[PDB]
Write an enzyme that holds these catalytic residues in place. Structure first.
Site, PDB file in Angstrom:
ATOM      1  CB  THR A   1     -13.081  20.819  10.357  1.00  0.00           C
ATOM      2  OG1 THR A   1     -14.196  19.596   9.473  1.00  0.00           O
ATOM      3  CG2 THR A   1     -12.790  20.980  11.814  1.00  0.00           C
TER       4      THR A   1
ATOM      5  CD  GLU B   1      -9.676  24.137   0.235  1.00  0.00           C
ATOM      6  OE1 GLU B   1     -10.271  22.996   1.049  1.00  0.00           O
ATOM      7  OE2 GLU B   1      -9.219  22.540  -0.471  1.00  0.00           O
TER       8      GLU B   1
ATOM      9  NE  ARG C   1      -6.939  20.404   9.248  1.00  0.00           N
ATOM     10  CZ  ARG C   1      -8.064  20.139   8.698  1.00  0.00           C
ATOM     11  NH1 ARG C   1      -9.680  19.970   8.579  1.00  0.00           N
ATOM     12  NH2 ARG C   1      -7.761  18.867   7.986  1.00  0.00           N
TER      13      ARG C   1
ATOM     14  CG  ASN D   1     -14.476  13.441   8.718  1.00  0.00           C
ATOM     15  OD1 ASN D   1     -14.942  12.761   9.064  1.00  0.00           O
ATOM     16  ND2 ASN D   1     -13.921  13.856   8.289  1.00  0.00           N
TER      17      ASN D   1
HETATM   18  C1  LIG Z   1     -10.070  16.083   7.720  1.00  0.00           C
HETATM   19  C2  LIG Z   1      -9.631  16.803   6.674  1.00  0.00           C
HETATM   20  O1  LIG Z   1      -9.349  17.242   6.822  1.00  0.00           O
HETATM   21  C3  LIG Z   1     -10.907  16.455   5.076  1.00  0.00           C
HETATM   22  S1  LIG Z   1     -12.481  14.753   5.083  1.00  0.00           S
HETATM   23  C4  LIG Z   1     -12.880  15.290   3.570  1.00  0.00           C
HETATM   24  C5  LIG Z   1     -15.084  14.313   2.983  1.00  0.00           C
HETATM   25  C6  LIG Z   1     -14.372  13.716   1.908  1.00  0.00           C
HETATM   26  O2  LIG Z   1     -15.784  13.157   1.568  1.00  0.00           O
HETATM   27  P1  LIG Z   1     -15.249  12.175   0.675  1.00  0.00           P
HETATM   28  O3  LIG Z   1     -16.899  12.035  -0.135  1.00  0.00           O
HETATM   29  O4  LIG Z   1     -14.505  11.565  -0.254  1.00  0.00           O
HETATM   30  O5  LIG Z   1     -15.187  10.778   1.769  1.00  0.00           O
HETATM   31  P2  LIG Z   1     -16.773  10.338   3.397  1.00  0.00           P
HETATM   32  O6  LIG Z   1     -15.938  11.748   4.205  1.00  0.00           O
HETATM   33  O7  LIG Z   1     -16.711   8.867   3.188  1.00  0.00           O
HETATM   34  O8  LIG Z   1     -17.774  11.368   2.991  1.00  0.00           O
HETATM   35  C7  LIG Z   1     -12.744  16.594   3.051  1.00  0.00           C
HETATM   36  C8  LIG Z   1     -13.886  18.001   2.492  1.00  0.00           C
HETATM   37  N1  LIG Z   1     -11.726  17.363   4.224  1.00  0.00           N
HETATM   38  C9  LIG Z   1     -11.559  19.083   4.333  1.00  0.00           C
HETATM   39  C10 LIG Z   1     -10.597  19.094   2.972  1.00  0.00           C
HETATM   40  C11 LIG Z   1     -10.605  20.477   2.375  1.00  0.00           C
HETATM   41  N2  LIG Z   1     -10.046  20.546   1.074  1.00  0.00           N
HETATM   42  C12 LIG Z   1      -8.415  19.762   1.243  1.00  0.00           C
HETATM   43  C13 LIG Z   1      -6.950  20.152   0.099  1.00  0.00           C
HETATM   44  N3  LIG Z   1      -7.879  19.039   1.970  1.00  0.00           N
HETATM   45  C14 LIG Z   1      -9.195  19.168   3.220  1.00  0.00           C
HETATM   46  N4  LIG Z   1      -8.369  17.605   4.019  1.00  0.00           N
END
Ligand SMILES: CC(=O)c1sc(CCOP(=O)(O)OP(=O)(O)O)c(C)[n+]1Cc1cnc(C)nc1N
Ligand SMILES: CC(=O)c1sc(CCOP(=O)(O)OP(=O)(O)O)c(C)[n+]1Cc1cnc(C)nc1N
Ligand code: SF4
Ligand code: SF4
Ligand code: SF4
Ligand SMILES: [Ca+2]
Ligand SMILES: [Mg+2]
Ligand SMILES: [Mg+2]
Lengths: 1231, 247, 123, 123, 62
Positions: free
Chosen positions: A30, A63, A113, A995
Site C-alpha cells: 500500500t 520487492e 509513502r 491485510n
Molecule cells: C502495513 C504493511 O505495509 C503490509 S501488510 C502485509 C500483508 C501480509 O500478509 P500475511 O499473509 O503475512 O499476513 P495477513 O495480512 O494476516 O494475511 C504486506 C504485504 N505489507 C506490505 C509490505 C510489503 N513489502 C515490505 C518489505 N513491507 C511491507 N510492510
C-alpha cells in the site's frame, strides 16, 4: 487521440505503464497495490501494450525479488516496469544501483509513502523516494492525478531514449487515491512518440548468447573510478531529453511542463519551492492571495534528479528576496532536507545574489497541508522568517512549528461545491460517492474530485468522503473543511463526532435517522448540533433511510436513499437531470436480475425525493441547553491521548503528547467499548453445560466466563443469573457466561458452536441486550478470575485464565485472533512477541488502540513490530538478548554461591540455577530471590537483585501470516529455525496476503481465486511444514481450532516446552476467503478443513526420536470426501466455478487429488521406522581453531578477500601436483 | 592502562566493539569480515567484555537478517553491535530507520566500501555510508588506524548515553587493512568511561513481559508527524555527548 | 527452422517480414541458467531461489556446494556439515547440513538432482 | 513411475577416512579430540539415516501427477465477485477503485442465525 | 555547523570539499551539499566553494 476519464493517480499512471511495458515484476504494498492489480486484470482481459501484446506480469516473493527480476528482464532486452512504495522501495535499492549503473531503461512507478521508524505508516510523504536519490535513477515528480498520467509517459519515453532508468513518483493517497476527471492518451499516440532507433539499440545491446558480452564484472582500484564516471555523458543529456518529451507530449495534449515550473506574480518577492501534490494547494492559495496584491509565487519541481540548476533559475523571479524550500521528509541530524540542500547548492554555485533561504517540513505520513498552512509559510517569509520549521503540527517541545490560523478564508475557485459524507463501513456510501463522481463527470463539463478517509477499524469503522465539483480545475489537495453539503449516514455519529464542523452558512445538512417527530429529534439530537443548525440557518433534512429501504424492499440497505439525497440537495446538478441521470444509471448498473430489483431502486429514489422535505426546527434551538458529561472513569492516558484520537482530534495533540521512541502502553482498548455489533449473543443458562467453548472461540474476547463463590455475588445485580458449578473441582462455585455486549462484533461463532441442540446462546439485537448486560459485565469484570482452580492448559481451564489480547480492531469473526487470545492465556505473562507486519500487527497495534494487555499483576506480552520481512530474526534477537543477559545473571549467581551470602539466598540461587530454563522452577526460586534480596543495592547481591525481570524463563514468540512465512520472511524463518535455538513461531495461515487486499501467496492453494491468481492459482500450496521437518530437530505442528481445541492446546504446550525451535501453522479463516454463510461459521469451516483432508493435523516432535519413537504423529483421519462442498462453500473457489466452470472443476479435482496424495505421504511418515536420533546436544569447551591450522597445502588464496591479520605464511599452493606426484617426481629426479 | 600494539583498522576496532557489546549478529562481507571473525574467535576463546561476560555472537543468513537480530537484541535490552559494509549495509537500511526510530544504543562498525553499479568492487569509498545518511544513525569517521580504535570507543560510549544508534566507519582496506603501531586501552579503562545510569535506564525501558509496552505501532495522519518529531531532543544532545566522550 | 528464416529473410527491412528478420537472436530456444554457491543457495538467496523454483518456469539452477562461503574466507553456511571447522564454526559446526534437496523435492513439480563428478561423469 | 531415483549406493563405511583426510575435520581432532570423535560419529549417523530415507523414497509407490501448464484461458475474476458477505474491510489498505459497495459485514451474525432471528422477531 | 565554523580560518578565501563517492545527477555530493548549506545559513562571508571527487574503489589519493 484523447479521452476523458475520472480515476485516481494510480490508474492514471498504470494506464501508461501497461502500454509502455513488456514485462513487470511485482509485489503488493500500500498504496501502490492498485497499479499491479490493474495491470494483472488488464492483461487477463486482453489489453494490448504498444507492441500489440498483453503484459507479462509476475508476483515475486518480495520487492527485492521483483527488483532483481526487473534487472534481469531489462538486461535481457525487455522494456520493464514495477510499482512500489516505502519499505518496498528500500528493498529495491541495491538493484537500483545496478539498473542505473548498467544504463537500463527501466521505470519504477512509486506512490511515495513514509518509512517505518518510531512507527509504521502507509500514508504519504517523500521519505522513501529520497532514500533512493543516490541510486542513479532519474526522478520525476507529478503533483496531480493528471500529472501522474503525463509524467508516467514522459518517464517511459525518456528512459527509453536516454538509457537512464526513471523513478516516476506521486504522493501516496493524496494523489494515488484521489479521484479526478482527467484526460488520457490512446496507446497509439504513446507508441508514435517512441524513439524507434533507441528501442532497436536497446534490443541489440542486451544479453543474448548469439552475441554475448560479460556484465557485472568485479573491478580493482586501477579502473573502477574510471568505469564509474563513464556514464556521465548519459546523465548530462537526460535533462534535455525529458524536456523534449515534455514538449512532444504537450503537442498532443496541450499541457506543457518544464523541469521546473513557476506560477504566481512575476515580481514575487517571497517564493516557495515544493514538490508533489503540495504544489496544487500552494498554487490555489497563490491565485487567491495574488489577486489581493500579494507578491508571492511557487516553483514546482518536476525533474528532481538530475538537478539542473539552470532550469531552476529559469523559473526563479529575480525579484524574489526570500525563498522557502518545502521538504516532505525528515533526515534526523542532516543540516537540512534534500530539496533544501539542492537549492542551496544552486545559489552558492551561481555565486551572485543570495536571497534569504528557509527550509520547511510538511506532510509527513499524509499530514494535511492546507491553505491556512500555506498562508503560514508565506507569512513566515515576511514576518519571523523562522528557519528549519515544521508546519502542520504543534511542536511545543523544540518549537520548530509555524503557528496556523484556521480562520483563513476558503480558497477554492469561485463556484466550487464541497461535500462531506459520514458513513459506516459497508453501508455503500463510498461506492455511492464514486458513482456520483462518474455520473456527474460523464454528464457535465464540471470537474470532479473525490478523496476518502477510512478507519483503522476493519469492521463497523467510520468513513468520511470529501467530494468537490466545479467549473474550474480542482487543485484542492486537502480535505474539505468548509462544506456546502454534509451528510451523516449513521445516526450513532450525531452524538459522538463533530459532524457539522466548518459547514457553511445556509449549508445543507442531511441526516439518516428515525427521529421524524420534533420530539424525537429534540430527544436524540445534541445541543451543539441544534445551536449550529439554528445559528447558521442550515437547510436541515432528516430521512428515515432505513424505513424506506425496508418499505421498497431493499431490506434496510440505505445506499440508494442517501444517494438520492445527494443528487437532489447537493446542488451540483438541476433536479430534473439529476433524478434522470441517477435513474438511467440504476437501469445501467443492476438490471442484471429482472426489473424487480431495478424497480425497488427506482422506487426508492422516487420515495426518497418525496420524503426529502426540509425539516423545520424551532428558533429556540439557537440556545438549546448545553448537556452534561456522563462520561465513565478511564485512564489519564485514555483521556488525554486515545479518546482525543478516536474522536478525530489527534491532529491537535502536540509533540509533547508522544514518547520519543514511539511506544504506547498496553490495554488502551479496554475502554473503547464501541458497541457496533448489530446482533449479540444472549446466554440461556437453562441450556448451558458449562463447557467454556464460547469464550475459547471468541475472536474478540467478548465472552467472560465467571466462577464466583457465594460471597462474591452479594451485590450482584438481580439479573446476574448464575448456575451452581458443574465439576468435581468446582463444587461450591457459582458459574456464569457473561456477554460483553459492547465489545462483541456479533459474528456468531460462539452461538454457532455452543454444544447443546437447545442452544445456550442465541443472537439478539444489541438494544435488547445492552441495558441489562452493560452493568452485568461491569460487575463481573470485578470478580477475581479463578486461574488456580483448573489446569491452565485444559479446554475449560484456559478460559479461567486472564486473556491478554482483547477487543482488537480485527474483522468480526476473524480467524486469527482466537488462536492468539488462547496463546496469551497460556504464556501471556512471560512472552515476547516479534510480530511480522500484516493483519496481526494491524489489529495488533494500530494507534491508538492497543489490544494486548497486562494481567492483575502487571505482566503482559512484550510486543513489537519490526518490519514485514524480519520478524523471525527480530525474535531471534530478543532470544539472543535473553541468552546473554540470563547467562550474565547465572554467572553472578554462581559467583554469589561462592561468597558469604546467607544459606537462604544460596539455597534460592542454587534452585534458580538448576531450574534456570524451567518456567515453573525459575519463577519459584526467582520469586524467593525477589523477597530475600529485597532492598539489597550493594555489590554482587545488588546486581542480582536488579536483574529480577530476568529470573523466570521467558517465552519468545514470532507471530506472522502466511505471506510473511511462505514468502518474504521465509529465508529468515528458515535460518532461525535452523539455528536450533529456543523460539516459537506461530503462523496464522489465511492462505493470502490479507491485510493488503487478498493477494496470492505461496501458501495460496491450487484453484483458489486471489489477486495475481484471478483464474485460480495454477501451482499447489507450498509445503512449509514438510520442508521444515527435513531438519529433524525442529518441532513442527499444524492446528485448526474448529477441528480440535484440545489438539491445539496440546500443540501449544508441546511446542513451547520444546527446548529447540518450534513452528506451529494454524488454519485461519478470513473475509478474503469469502465464507458463504458468514464468518460465524469459521469454527465449522476449520473443522471441515481438517475432516475433508484439506488441512491435516500432525506433530513432529524431535524428543520422541531421542527415545526410539517416531517423531511424526498424525492427529487427523483420512479425507472423508467432503472437500467438494468445503471448497464450494467459499467464494474464493465458488467464483471460479461460476466464471470458468470447466477449469474450476478440473482445479477442484486436482486439490482433492493433491490432498489425497499428501495424506498418504503423511501416513507412511507415521508408519516409518527410520528417523534422526543421536545425542541431545553436549560439547562446547572453551577454545577456537582455524580451519587452516596445520593443513598440508594452502587453505586460502592470494586474494584481498581472504587476507587476514595472521595470513601470509608460505604454503604449498597446489601448483606442483599431489603429495604423491611430487614424491614420485622427487624419486624420478633423484640427482 | 594503555598498550602498544601493531595491528590494522579492523582489529583496532573489533578490540573495542567486543569489550563494549554483549550481543552481535554478523554476516561476512569484505573488507569487514575480519572484525566478526575476530569477535567470534575471541568469544570462543573466553574473552570477557566489560561485564566480565563472553560475547553472544550468531551468524545470520544475510545482513538484513543480521540487522533484524540486532534490532531485536537492542529492543530486548542487550548492548549490540555488528560489522558490515557495502551491499551488506544496504540490506540493513530498513532496520536502521527502526533502530534509530526507537532510539536504541546500537553501534555499527562499517568498513566503507564501494557499491556495485556498473561493476562490483570490494574496495574503499563512502558510497555505502552515504547511502545510509538519512536513516537517523549518528555517523562518526576515523581516518587512521589509531583513530579507528578511539572513535569506535567514543561511538559506543556516546550511543549508550544518547540513545541514538551510531555508525562508526573507516575506509575499506586503506584503513581497515593498513597496519600501524598504535595504542589501545585496556577493557577496564573503557568500562570506567561508561554511563552506568544511562545503561540501567536502557535496560529498564527495554522489552520485558514483567513490565510490557507496545513498540512499532501503525499510525495515521493524525499523529505520525508529531511522533516523528518527538525525538528531536535526543538528536540535539548527540553532538555535545560525542564531544564529551572525545574529551 | 530459425536458421532457414535467417537465409530466407536476409535483407528484409519492411513490414512484418522485416520485423521478424530483426528478431533472429530470438529464433533458437535459449537455456537460462542460474549459477551460485551454497552460501547463496542455502542462505541469502534461498528465499528467491525457493520462489523461482516454485514458479514452475523453465530455468536451470546449478549449485556449486563448497560447504562454506569460500570467496570471503571460509565462513560457515547452512550447507556446512556437522563437525566441520570454519569461521563462525570455530569448534566444529554444531548443527547439521540443511537438506536443500529434500526441501525442494516437496513441491513435486521441480526437477532436483545431486552430482559429484569424481564418482560418475556419466551420471 | 516413481520420480525419485537413487544413483549411488549405501554408505560403504569409509566415511571416517574421508573426514580425517580433510583439515576442516582433522584440525578439530587435533584440538578438541573428544568433541571431534563425537561429531564425526554424529556425521556418520546422520548420513546413515539420510541414505535410509532416500532408499524409502526410492521404494515408495506414493507420488503425485505432473503437467507443464495449460487451462486458465482468457479472463480473470475478483475473489470478492458475488460473495454473500464483504470480502474486504473498512481499511484504506483494502480500498480499491471499484470498492465501496454495501455488503453484509458479519456484524449481524450468521446467515442461519439472521434467518432464525427474522423468523422469531417476525411481528 | 557551529563546530564546522569553529574550525574554519577567517582567512579562508577558497574552500574545496572532497567527497569520496558519486551520486549521479545530484547537484553535488553529500559533504559538499552539507558545507554549502552551512555558508548559506550563516549569511555572512561567502568564500568560493569547490566540489571535488576522489578515491572511488580505493583509487590512490596521493
Ligand atoms: C502495513 C504493511 O505495509 C503490509 S501488510 C502485509 C500483508 C501480509 O500478509 P500475511 O499473509 O503475512 O499476513 P495477513 O495480512 O494476516 O494475511 C504486506 C504485504 N505489507 C506490505 C509490505 C510489503 N513489502 C515490505 C518489505 N513491507 C511491507 N510492510
Ligand atoms: C565478492 C562479494 O562481495 C561476496 S563473495 C560471497 C561468498 C559466497 O559464497 P558461496 O558459498 O555462495 O559461494 P563460493 O564463493 O563459491 O563458496 C559473499 C558472502 N559476498 C559478500 C557479500 C555479503 N553480503 C551481500 C549482500 N553481498 C555480498 N556481495
Ligand atoms: S458473536 Fe462473535 S464477537 Fe460476539 S461474543 Fe460471540 S464469538 Fe465473540
Ligand atoms: S458454549 Fe454454550 S454450553 Fe458451552 S459454556 Fe458457552 S453457553 Fe455454556
Ligand atoms: S485476517 Fe482476514 S478476517 Fe482477520 S483481520 Fe485480517 S482481513 Fe480481517
Ligand atoms: Ca520452543
Ligand atoms: Mg495471510
Ligand atoms: Mg560455497
Amino acid at each position: 487521440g484523447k479521452k476523458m476519464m475520472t480515476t485516481d493517480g494510480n490508474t492514471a499512471t498504470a494506464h501508461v505503464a501497461y502500454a509502455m511495458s513488456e514485462v513487470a515484476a511485482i509485489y503488493p504494498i500500500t498504496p501502490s497495490s492498485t497499479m499491479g492489480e490493474e495491470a494483472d486484470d488488464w492483461a487477463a482481459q486482453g489489453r494490448k501494450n504498444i507492441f500489440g501484446q498483453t503484459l507479462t506480469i509476475r508476483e515475486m516473493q518480495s520487492e527485492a525479488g521483483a527488483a532483481g527480476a526487473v534487472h534481469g528482464a531489462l538486461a535481457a532486452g525487455a522494456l520493464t516496469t514495477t510499482f512500489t512504495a516505502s519499505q518496498g522501495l528500500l528493498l529495491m535499492i541495491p538493484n537500483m544501483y545496478k539498473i542505473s549503473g548498467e544504463l537500463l531503461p527501466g521505470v519504477f512507478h512509486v506512490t511515495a509513502r513514509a518509512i517505518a521508524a518510531h512507527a509504521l505508516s502507509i500514508f504519504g510523504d517523500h521519505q522513501d523516494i529520497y532514500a533512493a536519490r543516490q541510486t542513479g535513477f532519474a526522478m520525476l515528480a507529478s503533483s496531480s492525478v493528471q500529472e501522474a498520467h503525463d509524467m508516467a509517459l514522459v518517464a517511459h519515453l525518456a528512459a527509453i531514449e536516454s538509457n537512464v532508468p526513471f523513478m516516476h513518483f506521486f504522493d501516496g493517497f493524496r494523489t494515488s487515491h484521489e479521484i479526478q476527471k482527467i484526460e488520457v492518451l490512446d496507446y497509439a499516440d504513446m507508441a508514435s512518440l517512441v524513439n524507434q532507433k533507441a528501442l532497436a539499440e536497446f534490443r541489440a545491446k542486451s544479453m543474448n548468447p548469439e552475441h554475448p558480452h560479460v556484465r557485472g564484472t568485479a573491478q580493482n582500484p586501477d579502473i573502477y573510478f574510471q568505469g564509474r564516471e563513464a556514464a556521465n555523458p548519459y546523465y548530462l543529456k537526460v535533462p534535455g531529453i525529458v524536456a523534449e518529451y515534455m514538449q512532444k507530449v504537450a503537442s498532443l495534449t496541450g499541457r506543457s511542463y518544464k523541469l521546473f515550473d513557476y506560477v504566481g506574480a512575476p515580481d514575487a518577492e517571497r517564493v516557495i519551492v515544493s514538490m508533489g501534490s503540495s504544489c496544487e494547494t500552494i498554487e490555489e492559495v497563490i491565485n487567491h492571495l495574488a489577486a489581493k496584491g500579494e507578491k508571492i509565487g511557487l516553483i514546482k519541481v518536476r525533474l528532481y534528479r538530475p538537478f539542473v540548476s539552470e532550469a531552476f533559475f529559469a523559473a526563479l523571479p529575480a525579484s524574489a528576496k526570500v525563498i522557502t524550500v518545502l521538504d516532505r521528509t525528515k533526515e534526523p541530524g542532516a543540516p537540512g532536507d534534500p530539496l533544501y540542500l539542492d537549492v542551496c547548492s544552486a545559489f552558492v554555485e551561481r555565486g551572485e545574489a543570495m536571497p534569504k533561504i528557509l527550509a520547511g517540513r510538511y506532510g509527513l505520513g499524509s499530514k494535511e497541508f492546507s491553505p491556512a498552512m500555506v498562508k503560514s509559510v508565506y507569512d513566515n517569509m515576511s514576518g519571523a522568517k523562522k528557519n528549519h520549521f515544521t508546519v502542520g503540527i504543534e511542536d511545543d517541545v523544540t518549537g520548530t512549528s509555524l503557528p496556523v490560523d484556521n480562520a483563513f478564508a476558503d480558497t477554492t475557485p469561485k463556484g466550487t461545491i464541497q461535500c462531506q459524507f459520514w458513513g459506516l463501513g459497508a453501508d455503500g456510501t463510498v461506492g455511492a460517492n464514486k458513482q456520483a463522481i462518474k455520473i456527474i463527470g460523464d454528464n457535465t463539463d464540471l470537474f470532479a474530485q473525490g478523496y476518502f478517509s477510512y478507519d483503522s477499524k476493519k469492521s463497523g469503522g467510520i468513513t468520511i468522503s470529501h467530494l468537490r465539483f466545479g467549473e474550474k480545475p480542482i487543485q484542492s489537495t486537502y480535505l474539505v473543511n468548509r462544506a456546502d453539503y454534509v451528510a451523516c449516514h449513521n445516526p450513532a455519529y450525531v452524538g459522538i463526532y463533530d459532524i457539522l464542523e466548518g459547514i457553511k452558512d445556509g449549508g445543507t445538512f442531511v441526516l439518516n435517522s428515525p427521529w421524524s417527530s420534533l420530539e424525537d429529534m429534540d430527544k436524540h439530537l445534541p445541543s451543539g448540533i441544534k445551536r449550529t443548525i439554528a445559528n447558521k440557518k442550515l437547510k436541515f433534512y432528516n430521512i428515515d433511510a432505513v424505513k424506506i429501504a425496508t418499505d421498497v424492499g431493499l431490506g434496510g440497505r440505505i445506499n440508494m436513499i442517501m444517494q438520492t439525497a445527494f443528487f437532489k440537495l447537493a446542488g451540483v446538478l438541476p433536479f430534473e437531470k439529476a433524478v434522470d441521470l441517477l435513474k438511467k444509471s440504476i437501469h445501467k448498473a443492476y438490471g442484471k436480475k429482472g426489473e424487480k430489483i431495478v424497480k425497488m431502486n427506482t422506487d426508492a429514489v422516487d420515495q426518497a425525493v418525496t420524503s426529502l422535505q426540509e425539516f423545520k426546527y424551532p428558533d429556540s434551538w439557537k440556545d438549546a441547553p448545553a448537556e452534561t458529561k456522563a462520561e465513565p472513569m478511564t485512564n489519564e492516558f485514555f483521556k488525554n491521548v486515545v479518546k482525543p484520537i478516536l474522536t478525530q482530534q489527534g491532529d491537535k495533540l502536540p509533540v509533547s503528547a508522544f514518547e520519543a521512541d514511539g511506544r504506547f502502553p498496553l490495554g488502551t482498548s479496554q475502554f473503547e467499548k464501541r458497541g457496533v455489533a448489530i446482533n449479540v449473543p444472549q446466554w440461556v443458562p437453562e441450556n448451558c453445560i458449562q463447557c467454556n467453548q464460547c469464550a475459547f472461540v471468541c475472536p474478540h474476547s467478548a465472552i467472560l466466563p465467571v466462577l464466583a463463590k457465594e460471597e462474591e455475588l452479594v451485590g450482584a445485580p438481580a439479573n446476574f443469573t448464575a448456575l451452581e458449578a458443574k465439576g468435581k473441582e468446582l463444587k461450591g462455585y457459582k458459574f456464569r457466561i457473561q456477554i460483553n455486549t459492547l465489545d462483541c462484533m456479533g459474528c456468531g461463532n460462539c452461538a454457532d458452536i455452543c454444544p447443546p441442540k437447545e442452544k445456550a446462546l442465541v443472537m439478539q439485537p444489541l438494544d435488547t441486550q445492552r441495558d441489562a448486560q452493560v452493568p452485568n459485565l461491569e460487575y463481573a469484570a470485578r470478580i477475581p478470575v479463578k486461574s488456580e482452580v483448573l489446569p491452565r492448559d485444559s479446554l475449560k481451564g484456559s478460559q479461567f485464565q486472564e486473556p491478554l489480547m482483547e477487543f482488537s480492531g480485527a474483522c468480526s469473526g476473524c480467524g486469527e485472533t482466537p488462536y492468539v487470545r488462547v496463546i496469551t492465556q497460556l504464556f501471556g505473562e512471560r512472552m515476547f512477541i516479534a510480530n511480522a507486519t500484516g493483519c496481526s500487527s494491524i489489529w495488533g497495534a494500530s494507534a491508538p488502540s492497543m489490544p494486548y494487555k497486562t494481567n492483575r499483576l502487571g505482566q503482559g506480552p512484550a510486543w513489537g513490530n519490526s518490519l514485514f520481512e524480519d520478524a523471525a530474526e527480530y525474535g531471534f534477537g530478543m532470544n539472543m538478548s535473553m541468552f546473554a543477559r540470563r547467562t550474565h545473571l547465572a554467572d553472578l549467581a554462581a559467583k554469589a554461591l561462592e561468597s558469604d551470602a546467607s544459606g537462604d539466598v544460596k539455597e534460592a540461587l542454587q534452585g534458580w540455577l538448576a531450574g534456570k530454563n524451567d518456567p515453573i522452577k525459575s519463577k519459584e526460586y526467582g520469586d524467593k530471590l525477589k523477597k530475600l534480596l529485597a532492598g539489597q543495592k550493594d555489590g554482587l547481591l545488588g546486581q542480582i537483585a536488579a536483574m529480577s525481570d530476568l529470573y523466570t524463563k521467558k517465552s519468545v514468540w514470532i507471530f506472522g501470516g502466511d505471506g510473511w512465512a511462505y514468502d518474504i520472511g521465509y529465508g529468515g524463518l528458515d535460518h532461525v529455525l535452523a539455528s536450533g535455538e529456543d523460539v516459537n513461531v506461530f503462523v496464522m495461515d489465511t492462505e493470502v496476503y490479507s491485510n493488503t487486499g487478498g493477494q496470492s501467496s505461496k501458501a495460496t492453494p491450487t484453484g483458489a481465486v486471489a489477486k495475481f491468481a484471478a483464474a485460480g492459482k495454477r501451482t499447489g500450496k507450498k509445503d512449509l511444514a514438510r520442508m521444515v521437518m527435513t531438519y529433524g530437530y525442529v518441532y513442527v505442528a499444524t492446528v485448526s481450532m474448529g477441528y480440535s481445541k484440545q489438539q491445539f492446546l496440546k500443540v501449544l504446550k508441546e511446542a513451547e516446552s520444546f527446548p529447540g525451535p518450534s513452528l506451529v501453522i494454524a488454519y485461519a479463516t478470513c473475509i478474503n476467503q469469502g465464507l458463504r454463510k458468514g464468518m460465524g461459521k469459521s469454527q465449522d469451516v476449520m473443522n471441515t478443513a481438517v475432516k475433508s483432508g484439506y488441512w491435516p493435523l500432525f506433530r513432529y516432535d524431535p524428543r520422541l526420536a531421542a527415545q526410539g519413537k517416531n517423531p511424526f504423529q498424525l492427529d487427523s483421519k483420512a479425507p472423508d470426501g467432503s472437500v467438494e462442498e468445503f471448497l464450494m462453500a467459499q467464494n474464493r473457489f465458488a467464483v471460479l466455478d461460476r466464471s470458468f466452470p470447466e477449469d474450476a472443476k478440473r482445479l477442484r479435482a486436482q486439490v482433492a487429488h493433491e490432498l489425497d496424495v499428501r495424506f498418504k505421504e503423511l501416513e507412511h511418515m507415521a508408519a516409518t521406522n527410520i528417523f534422526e536420533s543421536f545425542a541431545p546436544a553436549g560439547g562446547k569447551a572453551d577454545g577456537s581453531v582455524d580451519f587452516g591450522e596445520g593443513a598440508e597445502f594452502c587453505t586460502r588464496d592470494d586474494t584481498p578477500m581472504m587476507a587476514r591479520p595472521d595470513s601470509g605464511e608460505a604454503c604449498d599452493q597446489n601448483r606442483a601436483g599431489t603429495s604423491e606426484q611430487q614424491g614420485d617426481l622427487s624419486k624420478r629426479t633423484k640427482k
